[PDB]
Symmetry: C2
Subunit: 405 residues, 2 copies
């Protein structure tokens, strides 16, 4: 940075703290990642200066010839990556991508069936304090109380009982592969649309490490951040038959001018994801998560669903008589960043919880491998088994610093 340090000492000092924080801590929040210098440069570009409401070749302002090339690069690379018939790369966020799909196919008060929020469903999949739950009538399917795998018979029964116009699959805290074929079969049985929110698993899907929802879903939404390792923002993928309606939902439906600089950054991230080394990266993410799961179990921890098929795991802390809130707090003391997270059938409130959610995307990006997974598990064991020992926490602190350098 050349100009910011001079122009704004206060903002610069805070950014510099955050940069050093990102290096010093072990980032295990499952939705986090570190983007490339190329992605940031694209976001830091003069493209912020351009109004480009509308779509490539069909804009409502002149002078869009070059931002059109950028947006088309993003749409085409997205289509290559996921094999979708249509892409919309304008959503400001995962929230707005979801919002636009709902706006496309639902009327106010329509019934929607989504994953139980406390079993791993997202806020925008029907929270009563979110637009989704306020605007539409959400009902939930659950996971099995023992296996913690989605109960597909429950998905079916809820669908047949409630007759939703739309079924939503995908999750913010589900550690196993989702069976999109079964979701579509259920949708077909009740004449519902299927939407898949792949935000968490999008990078794994791109790398062929999770089944692709695109062939099974009418709509696929995602964040461009998370496992896809892109800038913060949203995207919609859909069948050609919904392209016009989806585009109109985003604009003029729910947004105005797109963030052209962020779209440039999306194009860059999609370019990176198309490369062989991103496939190798994503495999290491899943390999690391499996290793971390097994190493945690070796430390005596219980995992929701008994392990993981993806980048993320959930520790059920009930055997240790700890809440997720307590675990999150004490790990923060030693420089390990997790979040408290409800487990399925959690006896605690969402503000306390009995679990912590952990993902390996971020640490894998910084080059951690299997040996590091073992050490992270060992440090978590040391901490959570000795919450009242300042000596144990100091040892943990030192071992965390050894990992991050």
């Amino acid at each position: 940075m050349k100009y910011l340090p001079q122009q704004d000492p206060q903002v610069f000092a805070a950014i510099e703290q955050e940069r050093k924080r990102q290096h010093a801590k072990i980032e295990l929040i499952a939705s986090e990642n570190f983007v490339s210098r190329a992605v940031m440069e694209a976001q830091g570009s003069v493209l912020t200066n351009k109004y480009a409401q509308g779509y490539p070749g069909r804009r409502y302002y002149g002078g869009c010839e070059y931002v059109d090339i950028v947006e088309e690069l993003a749409r085409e690379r997205a289509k290559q990556l996921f094999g979708a018939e249509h892409a919309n790369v304008q959503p400001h966020s995962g929230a707005q991508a979801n919002m636009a799909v709902y706006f496309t196919v639902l009327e106010h008060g329509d019934t929607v069936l989504g994953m139980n929020l406390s079993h791993g469903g997202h806020l925008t999949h029907g929270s009563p304090v979110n637009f989704s739950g306020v605007q539409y009538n959400f009902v939930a399917y659950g996971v099995d109380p023992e296996t913690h795998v989605i109960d597909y018979d429950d998905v079916r029964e809820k669908a047949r009982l409630h007759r939703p116009k739309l079924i939503v699959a995908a999750a913010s805290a589900y550690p196993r592969i989702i069976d999109f074929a079964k979701f579509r079969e259920i949708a077909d049985e009740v004449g519902a649309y299927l939407m898949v929110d792949m935000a968490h698993i999008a990078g794994l899907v791109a790398a062929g490490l999770h089944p692709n929802p695109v062939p099974y879903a009418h709509f696929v939404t995602t964040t461009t951040h998370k496992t896809l390792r892109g800038p913060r923002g949203g995207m919609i993928l859909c069948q050609e038959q919904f392209a016009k309606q989806i585009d109109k939902a985003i604009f003029p439906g729910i947004q105005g001018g797109p963030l052209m600089h962020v779209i440039a950054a999306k194009a860059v991230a999609f370019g990176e994801a198309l490369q062989d080394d991103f496939k190798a990266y994503a495999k290491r993410v899943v390999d690391n998560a499996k290793r971390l799961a097994s190493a945690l179990q070796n430390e005596g921890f219980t995992l929701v669903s008994g392990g993981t098929d993806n980048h993320l795991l959930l520790v059920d802390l009930r055997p240790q008589q700890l809440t997720g809130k307590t675990a999150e707090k004490v790990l923060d003391e030693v420089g390990i960043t997790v979040n408290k997270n409800t487990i399925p059938y959690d006896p605690e409130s969402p503000f306390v919880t009995s679990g912590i959610r952990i993902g390996t995307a971020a640490v894998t990006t910084r080059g951690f491998g299997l040996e590091e997974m073992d050490e992270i598990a060992a440090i978590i064991g040391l901490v959570l088994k000795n919450v009242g020992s300042e000596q144990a926490l100091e040892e943990a602190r030192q071992r965390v610093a050894a990992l991050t350098d």
Copy 2:
């Protein structure tokens, strides 16, 4: 840029075209501006890597100590700039700022009174193809057919007849000062909330060159781009009594994670706007617009409302028997960027129009003054009076290049 050129030649080449385009053209689109290198650096920062759902000191993820400082810097500087009791700097866009206010005070189907869209009201103030017009029952007040000034008696009569829960004031194409005191008086008479969307005039308000809506409105929304010359995004200002509800509307109501890098950039832009030289800049914007208006009238053009009180003007092209679409097209040929824009009581569709909208914020930022305004008016006269003369257009092209260098 160091890494983008190597990593992504295609994206870089397009960005470089756009950069050169921004320098070569005369940008008269009234909503456009050029941000500082400091603002871009902040947007290009590692802050994109941080999930920070919630608010400073009340986040749903750990490790937010430094992004909290950044967001608080943005909120505090916004409050200094506009004298508001509360600021929310998280809205992804002007659209989402407006969306959140509506979510806060309205139920589905509630009546809202806003400015006639073809008289200068925005898409999010009730377009039937926008969420605003679909979700709520919008009615419109108009400007006087002769003066093109808002008819405050019409605002009142519509309010008394329709009994809206909310009145919206502010515009995307209104060249005169808006009387917020009268809006509040009308709101008070019918027991409606008042929302002011100051997106266009926010920089002028910050510089004391347009009356401040904050003391009169329950809610003030704005973009951070436009006359405020910040990054692309939104903001809400409100009275303390609505702070909690407004914050909950943005999250968990309508958004998820905020764009912390963009918020950093907002803080930077607010810092710049607090400086004396931004006040001088904003005065030159208004001075330039007045000069440009007068110079256009000297060329024989008719202006909507007979001139301007702010950064923007609208040319009524009916005397020249030209549509806005034709004028926009031919100006694009010579390197002058305007948009076709409906005028009040336009006989043409919004896709054709009888007007062009012009603003001086962008050209003022690049250092244009009164002499340049005279020359821009002269070039527009040369072009619009000689639409069939390739020689005239080539002369125009050469004079445009002389201005931009």
